[PDB]
Symmetry: C3
Subunit: 132 residues, 3 copies
Amino acid sequence: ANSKVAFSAVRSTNHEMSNKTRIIYFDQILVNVGNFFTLESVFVAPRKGIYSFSFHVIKVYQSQTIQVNLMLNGKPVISAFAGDKDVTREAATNGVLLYLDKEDKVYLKLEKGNLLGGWQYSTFSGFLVFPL
Amino acid sequence: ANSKVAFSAVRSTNHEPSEMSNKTRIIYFDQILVNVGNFFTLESVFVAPRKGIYSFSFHVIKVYQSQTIQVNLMLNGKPVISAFAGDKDVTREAATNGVLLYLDKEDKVYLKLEKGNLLGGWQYSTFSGFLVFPL
Amino acid sequence: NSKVAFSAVRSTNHEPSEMSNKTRIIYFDQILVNVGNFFTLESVFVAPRKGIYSFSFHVIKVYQSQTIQVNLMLNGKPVISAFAGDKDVTREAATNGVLLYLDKEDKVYLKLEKGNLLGGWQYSTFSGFLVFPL
Ligand SMILES: *[C@@H]1O[C@H](CO)[C@@H](O)[C@H](O)[C@H]1NC(C)=O
């Protein structure tokens, strides 16, 4: 039970972010065991452990560049990029394992760019690999 | 019981799609690296043995030039996530994505070539997945 | 060792070592996770026990003029490949991922099969974990 933690979220075409935080949100929740993925955007770790994270953020409008940072408690840990102005729906993708303690916050930030065209079909997933 | 489940497959040649695959549009992988539980069948379809959360990932590599491709991860005949590879005039291009799904027993997960033809083959393409935890 | 995982990042834009140029092994300086310490300082993973392991990588470059091919290697042999390059963009990633059956002491690592890492490979990642022992 308490060792079972996972979330998976997708950006659809729903039409329900700030220049400060620039948090990328995912409206369609596919998995949320434990309900620790909150506000369509932020994962809050329930316990100390190793967690897997992966994401694909779609650069839809072709002539733009984006940079996406995976954030841990307000600080960047990994980065992804998409800036091929010949390509439509190019993914800025990366993944990582992290050592998290209880109440650690992990989310995606649009560090650079504007996601012109929207970011439909973008994905963001995470799960507890094992507790420590 | 059936708590260890995982598969992993790769397209090892540049051979063209089979005549059957042109009518189902289901992308298949001939080289099976992992198939614990033997739940990955027909070199293409994963059948969930039990209720739980399952991870999936895929990298479909197209050559130049098959037309712009769209790959959907399918769950019981309906698309869940999609990836795109529009040509950037290079020798090879990749349509990639991954996701966690809540699956029930006998649920079927597979890859569909929604758009495009994969002319020139899809060598080096990969498709993987595993049970994260039963539910 | 039921709990085995590593995750590593290339944190700088520094050129590869002369040794690295010789071995073609892509190395990572920043280790975020290394439970069991089976990911060595030479950026090679040594499987502690028989089991199914997950591996993912992203090799990111700022200079993409020439083609790069990255192979995931298992005891000196390629298992999967990733391609990038021959482009002029901000940053591009050669990426792929796979599950592998490993026997104990099997060696898994990234080799630059084609191309170079002129300009550095900052922000590149390489991760792996034991899904379950067999
Ligand atoms: C290794 O090769 C790269 C690519 O040509 C080059 O930039 C780098 O300077 C080489 N390393 C050394 C120590 O010369």
